Each structure stands twice: as structure tokens, then as C-alpha cells.
Amino acid sequence: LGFLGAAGSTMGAASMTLTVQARNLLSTVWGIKQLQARVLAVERYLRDQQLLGIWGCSGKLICCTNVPWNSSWSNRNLSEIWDNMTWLQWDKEISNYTQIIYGLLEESQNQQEKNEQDLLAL
Amino acid sequence: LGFLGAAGSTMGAASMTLTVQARNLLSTVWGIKQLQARVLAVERYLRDQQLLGIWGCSGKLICCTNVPWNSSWSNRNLSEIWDNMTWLQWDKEISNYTQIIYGLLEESQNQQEKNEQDLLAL
Amino acid sequence: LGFLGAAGSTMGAASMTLTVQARNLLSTVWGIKQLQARVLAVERYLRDQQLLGIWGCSGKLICCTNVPWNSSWSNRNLSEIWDNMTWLQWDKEISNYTQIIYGLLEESQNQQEKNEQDLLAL
Amino acid sequence: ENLWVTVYYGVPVWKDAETTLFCASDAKAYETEKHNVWATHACVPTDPNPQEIHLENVTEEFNMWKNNMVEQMHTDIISLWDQSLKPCVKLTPLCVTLQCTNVTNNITDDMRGELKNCSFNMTTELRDKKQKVYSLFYRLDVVQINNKEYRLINCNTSACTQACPKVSFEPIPIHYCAPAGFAILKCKDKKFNGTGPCPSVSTVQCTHGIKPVVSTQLLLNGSLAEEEVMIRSENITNNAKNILVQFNTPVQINCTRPNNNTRKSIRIGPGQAFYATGDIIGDIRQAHCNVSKATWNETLGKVVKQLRKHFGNNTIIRFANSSGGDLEVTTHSFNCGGEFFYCNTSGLFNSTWISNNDSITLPCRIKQIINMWQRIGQCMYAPPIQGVIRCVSNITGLILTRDGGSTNSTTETFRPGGGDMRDNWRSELYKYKVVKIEPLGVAPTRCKRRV
Amino acid sequence: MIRSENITNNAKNILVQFNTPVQINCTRPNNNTRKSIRIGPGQAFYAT
Amino acid sequence: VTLQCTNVTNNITDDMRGELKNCSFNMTTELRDKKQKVYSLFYRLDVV
Numbered sequence A, B, C: 001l002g003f004l005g006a007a008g009s010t011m012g013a014a015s016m017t018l019t020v021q022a023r024n025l026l027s028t029v030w031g032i033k034q035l036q037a038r039v040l041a042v043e044r045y046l047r048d049q050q051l052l053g054i055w056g057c058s059g060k061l062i063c064c065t066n067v068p069w070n071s072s073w074s075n076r077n078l079s080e081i082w083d084n085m086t087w088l089q090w091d092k093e094i095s096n097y098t099q100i101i102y103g104l105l106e107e108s109q110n111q112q113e114k115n116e117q118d119l120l121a122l
Numbered sequence D: 001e002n003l004w005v006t007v008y009y010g011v012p013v014w015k016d017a018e019t020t021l022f023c024a025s026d027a028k029a030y031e032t033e034k035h036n037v038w039a040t041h042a043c044v045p046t047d048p049n050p051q052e053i054h055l056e057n058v059t060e061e062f063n064m065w066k067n068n069m070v071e072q073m074h075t076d077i078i079s080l081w082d083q084s085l086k087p088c089v090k091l092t093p094l095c096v097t098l099q100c101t102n103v104t105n106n107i108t109d110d111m112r113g114e115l116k117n118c119s120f121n122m123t124t125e126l127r128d129k130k131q132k133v134y135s136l137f138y139r140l141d142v143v144q145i146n147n148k149e150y151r152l153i154n155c156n157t158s159a160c161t162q163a164c165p166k167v168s169f170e171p172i173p174i175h176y177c178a179p180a181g182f183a184i185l186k187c188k189d190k191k192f193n194g195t196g197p198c199p200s201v202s203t204v205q206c207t208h209g210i211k212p213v214v215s216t217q218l219l220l221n222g223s224l225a226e227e228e229v230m231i232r233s234e235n236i237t238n239n240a241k242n243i244l245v246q247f248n249t250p251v252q253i254n255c256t257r258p259n260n261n262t263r264k265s266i267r268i269g270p271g272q273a274f275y276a277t278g279d280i281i282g283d284i285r286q287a288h289c290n291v292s293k294a295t296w297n298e299t300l301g302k303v304v305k306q307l308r309k310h311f312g313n314n315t316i317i318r319f320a321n322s323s324g325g326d327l328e329v330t331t332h333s334f335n336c337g338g339e340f341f342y343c344n345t346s347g348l349f350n351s352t353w354i355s356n357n358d359s360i361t362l363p364c365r366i367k368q369i370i371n372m373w374q375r376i377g378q379c380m381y382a383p384p385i386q387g388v389i390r391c392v393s394n395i396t397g398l399i400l401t402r403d404g405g406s407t408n409s410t411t412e413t414f415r416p417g418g419g420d421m422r423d424n425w426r427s428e429l430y431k432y433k434v435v436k437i438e439p440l441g442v443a444p445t446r447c448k449r450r451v
Numbered sequence E: 001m002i003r004s005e006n007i008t009n010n011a012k013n014i015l016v017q018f019n020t021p022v023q024i025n026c027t028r029p030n031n032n033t034r035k036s037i038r039i040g041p042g043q044a045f046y047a048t
Numbered sequence F: 001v002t003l004q005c006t007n008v009t010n011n012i013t014d015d016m017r018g019e020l021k022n023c024s025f026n027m028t029t030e031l032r033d034k035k036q037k038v039y040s041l042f043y044r045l046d047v048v
């Protein structure tokens, strides 16, 4: 396995290794083109970390969260969504389910943030 | 509330939400101007993380620390500094108190760093 | 002590303070030269964090790991490698031992990653 | 029984995005010390052994007509082309009235009105002094004005320089690589008609060498097919768009310049030098090209049957040769050692096909000033080349255009097109599609975050 | 309102903007034709 | 180029008497050896 060497494989096996998919993520007319691409590439990498940073995890890259999960979003059993369906198909199924899952994570984590500070005093 | 939608409000309510203030923080003559601004903007964002990274916290954005706190710096009761005073007024009051609070955090965290490694052996 | 103020000193004392070595790490013809250097400098800083991020630590900068350690690599007692030998000499001794120590850390951490998620369910 | 939601980072998923690429040069190219066009000085060196790997259990859609890679590449070539002519001589003061006549040195009648001998008043390195020099000019480079007076066609239009004398126009194969966070998906399916599912898809960091050949029709030094020659088209039924077809077997080409030419150095100004053709040494002949009859007919006979599938089994196919296009879309344009050839093509598309050794030689003409990437506002002058040129190359593809919608006639005629540079590179980047990787991922999982 | 830096000092200008917009008419009743003159190869100059 | 220039009077209003001038000059053509002259109208403030 290498760079995206299991993208089309079952998501169960794909989740086994993730660093391989994250290694090759950061690494005079033409000078402008080279500089422009480099800045754009690094900018995207920092954006993802900022999105993950505000949550209850920094670099664990497996971020268990206690937020609820609506049943209507998936309406399917756990068994079928971890053995055969590939990741590419899953993304298309949640195309409309964007900008709303993130909101739940942020509001819950921030709400629990104060609850994780008051207890320290007593 | 939106981008800096509670900057002038009481600091007690301002501390309730912080991600909103942190969202809009990262996102051929004119080409040079655009590139220069982008590099400068991203550079500042990394500087803050580096300052926070060396402490005992990475992205929790509420970093409880065990360092002492001199009474003369504030010389005021806790009640009055959490209900009415706004954040802008607080910053002006600690204008002289800069480059010295950070030093306390770094020295204490590093000192406790070794103390948090020796115990692992035994 | 200042910027690399103890590089040649004993590694035992050098490990006492590390933030000082990490502070000065990030901070129209000439415009191209200035921009090129800045992008290159920041790019290296992010690369190190990405290498450290995938492991079981984000910014602790003392990353204890449970991976094994082959005796043949060092073949020396612990006492002599913590009192007199400087860091510069140590690096030359592990010149060939590169790209293989990192592999052990990644594979072990990822393997323990799933083991640290299954137990949560039960 | 309850399940909550977690997130996954680094999950492999791709989308569509717009982005630019950069150079990748091989070690062999780096060996050359000449800073010519497409040089390695401004192009980063490549890395050997690309990590090309296969992908399984995945289906990807591909498009070659809407691909953005060709569009940006077209702008890239012209951008670098202008930079090559900047730092050397300017040819603004060449416009001078010419009292010019013919020339006859045992010249073949087949090239009667093509060469002219005459002189003009040109400024020397100084200013007060004046001197005159003579040179030979081609027929297409001189117009008629009004007992006899001639002038260049470059004078009543924009003015341009000459090809810089310290660079070479020989094509160099370069590799295109996307920046970090973007990959390239390559389609290796044997059957690939441009648009459709591509079950056999493989990713690669960088692509193989692509030669930016200069040609309007009958592109040279292209990527050869493997088997079952295919036809590339967007709508087929609509004749407005061209048809791109590449065949399997390579058919060689011979194109020589039997005329011997000498270069004369003329001092225009201080530090400015202009090269002009001198006297001809030896006999006077005409440039031509040869193609093997057996190879050419066999290729046509092998491709004609293939095209019948789209239209019909009982379809009569005839080939035409086009007509006047101001020497822009009516010739086979190619370059050999810095010399541009615009030559005849009627000797190839002249056959008809029913439902059920010797070589072909064609005369033609050569002109110096050209308009490649037409760019009304600029042009370029072709310097003379010493000795003779004998270039050998391959033909890998053809460009065909359908006729009008007359009626339902079995007699269907295909005619060569050309003139569009975007179509030239579409035959080399039809297997590629840039992607945008999104590490973020969401999926339900039975886990709880302790407090 | 009236915009000024020191008022008392006359060296600096005074910026004043009023509320109601007052329209302006400015026409060119003379009819002019352009003539294309060839200066050089690719260079054109327009003259009245 | 030097201008041997004079006034112009085509039922011109006295309020714009000395404002328009008609004249020509020697200007280079698209070629170099050949020469030709053209005429145009210039404003008062553009001529010294």
C-alpha cells in the first residue's frame, strides 16, 4: 500500500492505516507559479488542523466525541456500513449533510469546556 | 453573534463562545500584494500556536496552569473582574504586564516536564 | 543561555531547557527573495509538527513511546550516554539509523490506536 | 443500543478542483548547457522511479474535452515563448523599400517565382554613415506596392524580432506534477472513448514525458496507440467540432532541404546583429517529403473500417484536401532544426473507399516570417540554417472534420482540419484528471468520550 | 458637517460635504472626427 | 516636429478665437525611406 493505495477498498481495511494517506500532504516567470502553489497547498493543511483543533482533540486523528447522532441521517444498520461500502460512496451519500454535523461538534465541545473547568475548583 | 459580535460585552459572556472569534482567522502587479498578505496572515496564526504549543496544552484553548499569581498585579477581588469589566479595558490594564507572565508559564511547565517523566520509570 | 547556548554542552544539561532552542524557529527585486525565504522557513516548521502529530503526542515535546528498542543500535550502557557525550556526536553515530526508527513509532502507535478505541464501547 | 458520531482524518476521498502545475525535468535534459526554450533552468528537476500504483474496486469518470489541463498548458507555452524573444536583438528598422527582381541560377522551373535577389539601404553600426547589403528573400515574404518596388508584409502590420540565435527550438519532453494535496488519476483502460466510466484507473505523482510539438494537422512525435485504434470525438454527429484519431503503427516521414544556404552577418546597430541569406552553393532544388505507399494505404485501410462502426457498415468514405486558408489551416506545419515548413498535403487525402518501393513526393514552399499562435500583434523571423536539414519523424495522429448536413447520403467525406492548438495537446492529456483530496471524514461509531 | 484638522491653522485644507445633491451639466457641442495616422509598423496615432 | 502653424477661421465664435490651429508636419510613415505629411487641429495650451 502507498499513496491512496486503498482508496477504493473496503472502509474497514482503509481505516487500518491513515498516516500513509497523510504523509504526502505537505511536501523568473515560473517563480511566481511555484510560490503560489506552495502557499495554497500549505494553507489548506492548516485549515484542517484549525477545524480539528477547536474540537476535543489535536492530532490523535481518531476523535471520539459524545455528541448525539440522528438516526434519520444514516437509517442503516452498523454491520453493512463497515464491511463492503467504500469511502467514496459514503461521501456522496452525505453530500447534503454538510455544515450541520460540524456545528453539533463545536457547540457540544464548548458547552462541556466550561463544565470541565468548574469542577477543578472543587 | 458573529465575528467579534460580543467584543464590547461583558467578559463573562464573551468567554462562553470562542470558536466564532477563531473561525475567520486563517481564511500581475496585484499578485505580489495578494501573496504578501497571505503569507503574513498565516505566519501570525502559527506564531500563536507555537507560543501555546510549548505550554502544557495544544488546542484546548482553555489552558489551566499551576503557576503562581502575584496579588499586586491585579489587587482586586474576583467578583468585579468577571461581571462588568470588558476585555478591552482589561488589556489596557496589563499593558506593562507583558513578556513577564509568559516567562513564568514556560519555566514552570518545563520544570514539571522532567518531574512528569522520572515517575514513569518507577 | 540563549539561542543554541548549550549545543556543545553535555546532553544531560541541554535537555533541561528546550523552548529556548525552539523560540527563534519561526520569526522590487528583493521582494521575491524575502517571500521565498519566508515560505521555505515556515514550511519546514510545519513538516516537523506533522511528523510529531501522527505519533501519540502533539506539543508535549517529550514524547514517551512504548515501541521496542534494539540493543545492537546503541550497544552501550545508559550511564555513559547521558553525562559526557554531546548531542552533536550522538547525531553522527545514528547517521545510518534513519528512516527506520520512525517506521517503528508509526506502526506501533497506529496499531495501538484501534486498541484504544474498541475498549471504549465495552 | 445507541451509536454516536466520530470523525476520521486522512481518509482517502477526491473531488474536482482547479489548480496549476509545475515543471519536472529529467537528468538527461539537465546535461545540456544551452538555455533554450523549455529549458531546465526555470524548470525544477524531476525524481526517478515514480510511485505509480494500481487502484481496485473503484470507478472514476473522465472527460477530455472539458479538462482544464489543456487550457492552462496552452497559456503556459505562449507565456514562455514570449520570454525567449525578449533579451536579444530587435528587428524594428528592417522595413525599407526594395527595388527587387527575380534570380536565375540554373533554377528549376518548379520553383521559378520563389527566390528574389536585391539589396536595400540599412543603417550601419554608426549613424552618419550609410551602406547597402543584399540578400535572398522568399516569395511569401514580399508583397506588391505601387516601375518596380517591393516591401515586406511585416511593415504594414505589427513589427517583431527574429528567433534568438542562441537558443534551439527542438522539442523537449517534460513532466507535469501537481503540488501537495493534489494527485493525478491516470486511466489505463484499453477501450476509452474520452467520456465514460474508467474501471482501470491508476494514480501517479507525475506524468510521462510530453513533447510540445508544433503542428496544425498531422501531429508529429505523439503518443502511439497500443491496439484497436480508437477515434476521439465530442459529439460525432455535430460537424462543428473536430475529430481526433490516432493510429497504432508508426508511419515514418522524410523531409529534407537540398538547398545549400550560407549566413551573412550584418551590423544593424551597436551590439545588434541580423542574419540574412547569402549566395546559394550548388544546384537549386525544391524541398519535398516522402511517405511509403504501402505503409500509408495500410494505415488508412485499417482506420477506415474502424470509423464505419459509428456511422454504418455500408458507408462510402472519401478523403478531400481542403482549400485556401491563407496558409494557416491548409498546410502541414512542422519544424526541423529551427526552420518552419508549410507544405502541401493534397497527396495524402486523395482516396475513396468502397463498402466491399514507390513513395509519394510533393513539392511545396518555405517562408521565413511566421505567425504561430497567430497573435495578430506579433510575429517572428526565421533565421537561416547552415548546411542542409534532413529530419526524420513519425506520424501518430490525424485531424478530421465532417461535412455539412446535406442529407442522408452514404457518400460521406472526411476532410482534414487543424489550426487549433488546443486540440494538439488533447491527444496527450486525455488520460489525466486533477483531483482534490479532503482528509476530513465523518462516520458513526460506538464510542464515548469520558469526562 | 465640516471636516478639518485644526481649523485655526489655515495651512491645511477644509473638507466639507453637503447633504442635498446638486446636479451638473457639461456638454461638448463641437463635432470631432478621428484620423488614423501610421507612425510605424504596428504603431497608430489618432489626431483630430 | 517643428510646426509652421497658423490660426483657423470657419465661422468660429469670437469667444474661442485663439484656441484652434490648423497646420501639418513631417511625420515618418510605416516605412523609413519614404516620407509624408499630415495635418490636424491642436489646442492653444498644447502649443508654445
Ligand SMILES: *[C@@H]1O[C@H](CO)[C@@H](O[C@@H]2O[C@H](CO)[C@@H](O[C@@H]3O[C@H](CO[C@H]4O[C@H](CO)[C@@H](O)[C@H](O)[C@@H]4O)[C@@H](O)[C@H](O[C@H]4O[C@H](CO)[C@@H](O)[C@H](O)[C@@H]4O)[C@@H]3O)[C@H](O)[C@H]2NC(C)=O)[C@H](O)[C@H]1NC(C)=O
Residues within 6 Å of the ligand: D344, D345, D346, D347, D363, D364
Ligand atoms: C498541392 O499539390 C497539388 C497536386 O495536385 C496542386 O494542384 C496542382 O497544381 C498544379 C500546379 O499549378 C496544376 O498543374 C496545372 O494544371 C493545369 C492542367 O494540368 C493538368 O492537365 C493538363 C492537360 O489539360 C496536363 O497536361 C497536366 O499534366 C495536368 O494533368 C494547367 O493549368 C497547368 O499547365 C501548366 O503547364 C503548361 C506546360 O505543360 C503551361 O503551358 C501552362 O501555362 C501551365 O503553366 C498545369 O498543368 C495541377 O492541375 C493541380 N492539380 C492537380 C490534380 O495536379 C496544388 O496546387 C498544390 N497546392 C499548393 C498550395 O501548393
Ligand SMILES: *[C@@H]1O[C@H](CO)[C@@H](O[C@@H]2O[C@H](CO)[C@@H](O[C@@H]3O[C@H](CO[C@H]4O[C@H](CO)[C@@H](O)[C@H](O)[C@@H]4O)[C@@H](O)[C@H](O[C@H]4O[C@H](CO)[C@@H](O)[C@H](O)[C@@H]4O)[C@@H]3O)[C@H](O)[C@H]2NC(C)=O)[C@H](O)[C@H]1NC(C)=O
Residues within 6 Å of the ligand: D168, D170, D171, D213, D214, D220, D221, D334, D335, D336, D337, D386, D391, D392, D393, D394
Ligand atoms: C521528432 O522526433 C525526431 C526523432 O527523434 C526528431 O528528429 C531528430 O532531431 C534531433 C534534433 O534536431 C536530431 O538530433 C541532432 O540535431 C542536430 C541538428 O541541428 C544541429 O546543427 C547545427 C549545425 O551548426 C547546430 O548548431 C545546432 O545546434 C544543431 O545541433 C545536431 O546536433 C545532431 O547532429 C550532429 O550530432 C550528432 C550526434 O548528436 C551526430 O551523429 C551528427 O553527425 C551531427 O554531428 C543531431 O542530428 C536528430 O538527428 C533527429 N533525428 C533522429 C533522432 O532520428 C525531430 O526533431 C522531432 N521533432 C519533430 C517536429 O518531428
Ligand SMILES: *[C@@H]1O[C@H](CO)[C@@H](O[C@@H]2O[C@H](CO)[C@@H](O[C@@H]3O[C@H](CO)[C@@H](O)[C@H](O)[C@@H]3O)[C@H](O)[C@H]2NC(C)=O)[C@H](O)[C@H]1NC(C)=O
Residues within 6 Å of the ligand: D193, D194, D195, D196, D233, D234, D235
Ligand atoms: C462513449 O461510449 C459510451 C457508451 O456507449 C457513450 O454513452 C452513451 O452515449 C449515447 C449517446 O449520447 C447515449 O445514448 C442515449 O442516451 C440517453 C440515455 O442515457 C437517451 O437519449 C437514449 O436512450 C440513448 O441511450 C447512451 O445512453 C450512453 N450510454 C451510457 C451507458 O452512458 C458515450 O457517449 C461515448 N462517449 C463519446 C465521447 O463518444
Ligand SMILES: *[C@@H]1O[C@H](CO)[C@@H](O[C@@H]2O[C@H](CO)[C@@H](O[C@@H]3O[C@H](CO)[C@@H](O)[C@H](O)[C@@H]3O)[C@H](O)[C@H]2NC(C)=O)[C@H](O)[C@H]1NC(C)=O
Residues within 6 Å of the ligand: D235, D237, D238
Ligand atoms: C450533437 O449534435 C446533434 C445534431 O446537431 C444535436 O442534436 C440537435 O440538437 C439541436 C438543439 O436542440 C436540435 O435543434 C432543434 O431540433 C428540432 C428539429 O429541428 C427542433 O426543435 C428545432 O427546429 C431545432 O432544429 C437538432 O434538431 C438536433 N439534431 C438531431 C437530434 O439530429 C445534439 O444535441 C448534439 N449533442 C451534444 C451532446 O452536443
Ligand SMILES: *[C@@H]1O[C@H](CO)[C@@H](O[C@@H]2O[C@H](CO)[C@@H](O[C@@H]3O[C@H](CO)[C@@H](O)[C@H](O)[C@@H]3O)[C@H](O)[C@H]2NC(C)=O)[C@H](O)[C@H]1NC(C)=O
Residues within 6 Å of the ligand: D251, D252, D253, D254, D290, D291, D292, D392
Ligand atoms: C526515408 O529515407 C530513409 C533512407 O533511405 C529510409 O530508411 C532507410 O531504409 C533503408 C531501406 O530499408 C534502410 O537500409 C536497409 O534496410 C533494410 C533493413 O532490413 C535492408 O534492406 C538493409 O540491410 C539496409 O539496412 C536504412 O537503414 C533506412 N535508414 C534509416 C535512417 O531509417 C526510410 O524508409 C524513408 N522513409 C521514411 C522515413 O518515411
Ligand SMILES: *[C@@H]1O[C@H](CO)[C@@H](O[C@@H]2O[C@H](CO)[C@@H](O[C@@H]3O[C@H](CO)[C@@H](O)[C@H](O)[C@@H]3O)[C@H](O)[C@H]2NC(C)=O)[C@H](O)[C@H]1NC(C)=O
Residues within 6 Å of the ligand: E006, E008, E009
Ligand atoms: C492650530 O493652529 C494654532 C494657530 O497656529 C496653533 O497654535 C499656535 O501654536 C504655535 C506653536 O506653538 C504658537 O507659536 C508661538 O506662540 C507664542 C505667541 O506668539 C510664542 O511662543 C511664539 O512667538 C510663537 O508664535 C502660536 O502662538 C499658537 N497660536 C495660537 C494659540 O493662536 C495650534 O497649536 C494648532 N493646533 C494643532 C493641533 O495643530
Ligand SMILES: *[C@@H]1O[C@H](CO)[C@@H](O[C@@H]2O[C@H](CO)[C@@H](O[C@@H]3O[C@H](CO)[C@@H](O)[C@H](O)[C@@H]3O)[C@H](O)[C@H]2NC(C)=O)[C@H](O)[C@H]1NC(C)=O
Residues within 6 Å of the ligand: E022, E023, E024, E025
Ligand atoms: C441639465 O439639463 C437637463 C436636461 O434639460 C436637466 O434635467 C431635465 O430637467 C427637465 C426639466 O425639469 C426634465 O423634464 C421635465 O421635468 C419635470 C419632472 O417633474 C417636468 O417638468 C416634466 O414632466 C419633465 O419630465 C428632464 O427629465 C430632466 N432630464 C434629466 C436627464 O434629468 C437638468 O436639470 C439640468 N441641470 C443639471 C443636471 O444640473
Ligand SMILES: *[C@@H]1O[C@H](CO)[C@@H](O[C@@H]2O[C@H](CO)[C@@H](O)[C@H](O)[C@H]2NC(C)=O)[C@H](O)[C@H]1NC(C)=O
Residues within 6 Å of the ligand: D101, D102, D112, D113
Ligand atoms: C519574374 O518571374 C515572373 C514569373 O515568370 C515574371 O512575370 C510574372 O508573371 C505573372 C503571371 O501571372 C505575374 O502575375 C507576376 O506578377 C509576374 N512576376 C513579377 C512581376 O515579379 C516576371 O516578369 C519576372 N520578373 C523579372 C524582373 O524578370
Ligand SMILES: *[C@@H]1O[C@H](CO)[C@@H](O[C@@H]2O[C@H](CO)[C@@H](O)[C@H](O)[C@H]2NC(C)=O)[C@H](O)[C@H]1NC(C)=O
Residues within 6 Å of the ligand: D103, D105, D117, D118, D134, D278, D279, D280
Ligand atoms: C545577387 O546579386 C548580387 C548583385 O546585386 C550579386 O553579387 C555579385 O556577385 C558577383 C559574383 O561574385 C560579383 O562579381 C559582383 O561584383 C557582385 N555584385 C555586387 C553588386 O556586389 C550576387 O552574386 C547575386 N546572388 C545570386 C545568388 O545570384
Ligand SMILES: *[C@@H]1O[C@H](CO)[C@@H](O[C@@H]2O[C@H](CO)[C@@H](O)[C@H](O)[C@H]2NC(C)=O)[C@H](O)[C@H]1NC(C)=O
Residues within 6 Å of the ligand: D254, D255, D256, D289, D290, D359, D361
Ligand atoms: C524523396 O523522393 C524523391 C523522389 O523519388 C527523391 O528524389 C530522387 O533522389 C534520388 C537519389 O538518388 C535521385 O537520383 C533522383 O533524381 C531524385 N528524383 C526522383 C524523381 O527520384 C528524394 O531523394 C527522396 N528523398 C529522401 C530524403 O529519401
Ligand SMILES: *[C@@H]1O[C@H](CO)[C@@H](O[C@@H]2O[C@H](CO)[C@@H](O)[C@H](O)[C@H]2NC(C)=O)[C@H](O)[C@H]1NC(C)=O
Residues within 6 Å of the ligand: D407, D408
Ligand atoms: C432521410 O432524411 C430525410 C430528412 O430528415 C427524411 O425525410 C422525411 O421522411 C419522412 C418519412 O416518413 C417524412 O414524413 C418527412 O416529412 C421527411 N422530412 C423531410 C423531407 O424533411 C427521410 O425519411 C430520410 N430517409 C430515411 C430512409 O430515413
Ligand SMILES: *[C@@H]1O[C@H](CO)[C@@H](O[C@@H]2O[C@H](CO)[C@@H](O)[C@H](O)[C@H]2NC(C)=O)[C@H](O)[C@H]1NC(C)=O
Residues within 6 Å of the ligand: F006, F007, F017, F018
Ligand atoms: C491669430 O489670432 C491672433 C488673435 O487675434 C492674432 O494676433 C494675436 O494677438 C495677440 C495680442 O495680444 C498676441 O499676443 C498673439 O501672439 C497673436 N497671436 C498669434 C501671433 O498667433 C494673430 O495674428 C492671428 N494669426 C494669424 C496667422 O492670422
Ligand SMILES: *[C@@H]1O[C@H](CO)[C@@H](O)[C@H](O)[C@H]1NC(C)=O
Residues within 6 Å of the ligand: A070, A071, A072
Ligand atoms: C432528527 O431528524 C429528524 C428528521 O429530520 C428531526 O425531526 C429531529 O428533530 C432530529 N433530531 C434532533 C435531535 O436534531
Ligand SMILES: *[C@@H]1O[C@H](CO)[C@@H](O)[C@H](O)[C@H]1NC(C)=O
Residues within 6 Å of the ligand: A092, A093, A095, A096
Ligand atoms: C441533495 O439535496 C438536493 C435537494 O435539496 C437534491 O436535489 C440532491 O440530489 C441531493 N444530493 C444528494 C447527493 O443526494
Ligand SMILES: *[C@@H]1O[C@H](CO)[C@@H](O)[C@H](O)[C@H]1NC(C)=O
Residues within 6 Å of the ligand: B070, B071, B072
Ligand atoms: C510580587 O510582586 C511584588 C511587588 O512587586 C514583589 O516584591 C514580589 O517579589 C513578587 N512576588 C513574586 C513571587 O514574584
Ligand SMILES: *[C@@H]1O[C@H](CO)[C@@H](O)[C@H](O)[C@H]1NC(C)=O
Residues within 6 Å of the ligand: B092, B093, B095, B096
Ligand atoms: C506603563 O508604565 C509606564 C512607566 O513605566 C507608564 O508611563 C505607563 O502609563 C504605563 N502604562 C499603563 C497602560 O498603565
